[PDB]
């Protein structure tokens, strides 16, 4: 059955500035994603050629308290629209092995979302 990971919106927290806790979620095929706005200023949104084959970009209003159903496997890298270069981003793995996550890594983005992106994979590994 469907399963709900919280995900929070924040000015700062454990990793600095601009943050989704927790930055990485993993899900499976008809779970949701619940972002919510606990400090102003942040959304969520699909970045450009970072999420699963088949799946729909996404793209939530500001301070919106956004539920994302997740159902093609594979990984998803969103960001907060205003805050991508600050590192304001979450990886979402839907299924084991997730077979876009290697793509995602290499592909061209900010320094901090980088390290952001490489420190959750090692923590979920
Ligand atoms: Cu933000």
Same mark, same amino acid.
């Given at each position: 059955?469907?399963?709900?990971?919280?995900?929070?919106?924040?000015?700062?927290?454990?990793?600095?500035?601009?943050?989704?806790?927790?930055?990485?979620?993993?899900?499976?095929?008809?779970?949701? #994603?619940?972002?919510? %706005?606990?400090?102003?200023?942040?959304? $969520?949104?699909?970045? &450009?050629?970072? =999420?699963?084959?088949?799946?729909?970009?996404?793209?939530?209003?500001?301070?919106?308290?956004?539920?994302?159903?997740?159902?093609?496997?594979?990984?998803?890298?969103?960001?907060?629209?205003?805050?991508?270069?600050?590192?304001?981003?979450?990886?979402?793995? #839907?299924?084991?092995? %997730?077979?876009?996550?290697?793509?995602? $890594?290499?592909?061209? &983005?900010?320094? =901090?979302?980088?390290?952001?992106?490489?420190?959750?994979?090692?923590?979920?590994?």
């Amino acid at each position: 059955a469907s399963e709900n990971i919280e995900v929070h919106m924040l000015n700062k927290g454990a990793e600095g500035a601009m943050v989704f806790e927790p930055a990485y979620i993993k899900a499976n095929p008809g779970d949701t #994603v619940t972002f919510i %706005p606990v400090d102003k200023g942040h959304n $969520v949104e699909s970045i &450009k050629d970072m =999420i699963p084959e088949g799946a729909e970009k996404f793209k939530s209003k500001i301070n919106e308290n956004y539920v994302l159903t997740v159902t093609q496997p594979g990984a998803y890298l969103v960001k907060c629209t205003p805050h991508y270069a600050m590192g304001m981003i979450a990886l979402i793995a #839907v299924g084991d092995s %997730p077979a876009n996550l290697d793509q995602i $890594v290499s592909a061209k &983005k900010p320094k =901090i979302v980088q390290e952001r992106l490489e420190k959750v994979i090692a923590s979920a590994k």
